[PDB]
Design a protein around this ligand. Structure first.
Ligand SMILES: [Mg+2]
Length: 604
DNA sequence: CAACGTCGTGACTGGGAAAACCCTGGC
DNA sequence: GCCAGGGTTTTCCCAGTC
DNA sequence: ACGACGTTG
């Protein structure tokens, strides 16, 4: 770490000299810093650059600390750097460049030449290799501990903002960060040049997805606090009466959200044997035992409704309206990308993905999500997309014929297992079939099937054998992928994304079974996520090309929620059909079920 | 070396509450 | 030196996608 | 209900 070899820039002439160094550099680190972690407001503080290793410069344009001399106006710096920033040819590297692009766009400047981002480099090298933030990269490829903001800030309360810190140590911090990013890129990129499939995935899918994520985050989502506030009162009422009834049944007052007290009082009153134990080892009060014991006593069922209602109230109606952005009135998520081993995206801050559906109050909270005036919600969805993936990859003639006809075998198997007629199967039974069938594809044991559907374990075994008799090509494909994981030491997706499994070697056996099932799991879900990502890329490309009133707000796993004006509905629906159907070259069509409604629940 | 008792027995996520424990500050 | 409180960690348990 | 692994005879 060639520290203290950098420079802090306080004059515009040295800024001209620095950019005259920059424009001819092939790649150069670039990062910006701000006081707050919320990108939406995020008033800017400063920026840094670095051309060659050991050399970096910081320009403080906004600080408030006592006696700040000759800090360059942010306007002049932005005007001078705009030709470099808006240039497409210029190639840049950095950390969390989505944040940087968002901050720049807050001032009306769109960064174009996003060449490489270190976190994506590390993620595409090896998904399961620890954390992918800056500290882990520094530790595992530079072996040099770096100065963190905690060192110059407070412990847990008095974390003074980056604007009110002195220029010297702040500039050294920023220059060191930019430099470490630079050597990380220079070390990591040639190593990625070695492999082919990961290189193609990195060049095609991952990187161009930063601007679309930034724009989607900047769009925001609209919600009404009023409906949530109203629903909260009925939640509180219902929980009050159910709690009163439960405590009159027990004759004692205890917290029904406290698992310890619940299990103690239950197992000391009923005196019945505990059927299942916690993974750490203890009496447990999970769902399935509760539905099992509800037939005998009213306390199990009433605490079941209590658990559901309390979870709903304490999570959704108490987090969603509180986190609304003040100046815009629209909720903003995070959408971190390099977090999952498989490759799918994951919402972080408010987690607008696990919105309850099955419960009537769940579809009510779904109804709560509404659109602004003259705008209608449009949903574009794949159906059984990974089933089409699996049929394409295994070339099983049964699945090929079923998808050629378009049969809802996903629902037909539910009708068979539950005994329901094909026409009377409901949504929850469809979800249960989803779980059962797809676990059966993923090696889900017959004991798990007996637990899920309450059917005898013998029936679970026999019907698993039957299901694999229908599709023997599927079984031999899992066997082939197991052999591939054993030999290669990893599993690769169709487009080239990889998952390294260090547990494929013999280790107590049981651990390998999880590693084995993950080896089967990785390709299918990875390809589904990659198809979703490329569909988003093409859709947003058309968005930027045409610039109509359509906006994109939300991404749910196998779902793309839109925002269109009420006047134009069918045209954008056909456009989405054309782009989303033709995004991926696959044997069977990627059938899409478009939907339009007033609010989110109306769409689906 | 064999038999029996115990430990699992789809994947991928975030997060809430409760509780426990440990570290540090104050008297 | 000791106790209490707060912060951090650990356990159950539950809400989604397939 | 059944297989895997550790412990004990
Ligand atoms: Mg971010």
């Amino acid at each position: 770490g060639p520290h203290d070899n950098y420079v802090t820039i306080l004059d515009e002439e040295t800024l001209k000299a620095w950019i005259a160094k920059l424009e001819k550099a092939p790649v150069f680190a670039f990062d910006t810093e701000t006081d707050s972690l919320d990108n939406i407001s995020a008033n800017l503080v400063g920026l840094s650059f670095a051309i060659e290793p050991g050399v970096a410069a910081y320009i403080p344009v906004a600080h408030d600390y006592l006696d700040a001399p000759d800090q360059i106006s942010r306007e002049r710096a932005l005007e001078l750097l705009k030709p470099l920033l808006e240039d497409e040819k210029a190639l840049k590297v950095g950390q969390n460049l989505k944040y940087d692009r968002g901050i720049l766009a807050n001032y009306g400047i769109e960064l174009r030449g996003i060449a490489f981002d270190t976190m994506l480099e590390s993620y595409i090298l090896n998904s399961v290799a620890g954390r992918h933030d800056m500290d882990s990269l520094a530790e595992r490829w530079l072996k040099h501990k770096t100065i963190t903001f905690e060192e110059i800030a407070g412990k847990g309360k008095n974390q003074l903002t980056f604007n009110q810190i002195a220029l010297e140590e702040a500039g050294r911090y920023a220059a060191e960060d930019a430099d470490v990013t630079l050597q990380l890129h220079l070390k990591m990129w040639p190593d990625l040049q070695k492999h082919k499939g990961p290189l193609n995935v990195f060049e095609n899918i991952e990187m161009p997805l930063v601007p679309v994520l930034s724009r989607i985050e900047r769009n925001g989502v609209k919600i009404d606090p009023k409906v949530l506030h109203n629903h909260s009162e009925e939640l509180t009422l219902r929980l009050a009466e159910l709690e009163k009834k439960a405590h009159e049944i027990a004759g004692e007052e205890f917290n029904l959200s406290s698992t310890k007290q619940l299990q103690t009082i239950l197992f000391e009153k009923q005196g019945i044997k505990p059927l299942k134990k916690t993974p750490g080892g203890a009496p447990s009060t999970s769902e399935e035992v509760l539905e099992e014991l509800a037939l005998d006593y009213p306390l199990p069922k009433v605490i079941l409704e209590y658990r559901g209602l309390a979870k709903l109230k304490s999570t959704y109606t108490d987090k969603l309206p509180l986190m609304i952005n003040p100046k815009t009135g629209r909720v903003h998520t995070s959408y971190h990308q390099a977090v999952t081993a498989t490759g799918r995206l994951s919402s972080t801050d408010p987690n607008l993905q696990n919105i309850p559906v099955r419960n009537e109050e769940g579809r009510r909270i779904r109804q709560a999500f509404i659109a602004p005036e003259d705008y209608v919600i449009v949903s574009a969805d794949y159906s059984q997309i990974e089933l089409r993936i699996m049929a394409h990859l295994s070339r099983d003639k049964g699945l090929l014929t079923a998808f050629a006809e378009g049969k809802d075998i996903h629902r037909a198997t539910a009708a068979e297992v539950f005994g329901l007629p094909l026409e009377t199967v409901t949504s929850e039974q469809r979800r249960s079939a989803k779980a059962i069938n797809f676990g059966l594809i993923y090696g889900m044991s017959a004991f798990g099937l007996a637990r899920q559907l309450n059917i005898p374990r013998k029936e679970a075994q026999k019907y698993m054998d039957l299901y694999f008799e229908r599709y023997p090509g599927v079984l031999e494909y899992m066997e082939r992928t197991r052999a591939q994981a054993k030999e290669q030491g990893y599993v690769e997706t169709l487009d080239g994304r990889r998952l390294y499994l260090p547990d494929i070697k013999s280790s107590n056996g049981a651990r390998r079974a999880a590693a084995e099932r993950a080896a089967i799991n990785a390709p299918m879900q990875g390809t589904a996520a990659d198809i979703i990502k490329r569909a988003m890329i093409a859709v947003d490309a058309w968005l930027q090309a045409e610039q109509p009133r359509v906006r994109m707000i939300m991404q749910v796993h196998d779902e793309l929620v839109f925002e269109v004006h009420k006047d134009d509905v069918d045209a954008v629906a056909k456009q989405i059909h054309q782009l989303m159907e033709n995004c991926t070259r696959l044997d069977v069509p990627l059938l899409v079920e478009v939907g339009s409604g007033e609010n989110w629940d109306q769409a689906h």
